[PDB]
Design a protein around this nucleic acid. Structure first.
Ligand code: NA
Ligand code: NA
Lengths: 93, 93
DNA sequence: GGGAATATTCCC
DNA sequence: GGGAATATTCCC
């Protein structure tokens, strides 16, 4: 499991970040709320940048898809709450 | 000129970093003094890491060579004090 | 030092 | 969103 996936799981799961990034209700996707504050305040604590576009570039590199200020939602079939055993099934493109 | 070369020039030229990274006497190379403190304190102000090996990986990627705690010295034929016009001649391998 | 994997940036 | 350039990491 590459660092991006382990950090992303920690990021979503961690309670102290849930103001900005957290599981959806059904646990089959995650939400990013307050994207401007998320990228300035949260991203540089886990990654080497503060750019939402670079975070989303990584999501796309691992096959995450968007779920169609305001919350944004992303999903991967093998990124599921309580099922971190599926993380090894996610492949970098 | 890629970001590494412009930052490296700024890093060497800047007086406030000369405790750790500075031109040699003849201006044809630069010196890194106190490498442990250089990488913990100076590198993360200009790059996205604090690892001497990653800085040296970039030097090698641009054709810099080492000049044979203790000071270490690096040179490139087109990295010359007062001649930043030569920076465009440095090529990434 | 350098090849190659992953990360970030840049641009279409 | 994704190709490709540059940056950083990892390993030999
Ligand atoms: Na969270
Ligand atoms: Na300096």
């Amino acid at each position: 499991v590459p660092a991006f996936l382990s950090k992303l799981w920690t990021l979503v799961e961690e309670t102290h970040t849930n103001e900005f990034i957290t599981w959806s209700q059904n646990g089959q996707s995650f939400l990013v709320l307050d994207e401007q504050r998320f990228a300035k305040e949260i991203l540089p604590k886990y990654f080497k940048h503060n750019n939402m576009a670079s975070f989303v570039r990584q999501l796309n590199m691992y096959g995450f898809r968007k779920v169609v200020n305001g919350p944004v939602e992303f999903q991967h079939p093998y990124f599921k709450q309580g099922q971190d055993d599926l993380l090894e099934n996610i492949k970098r493109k």
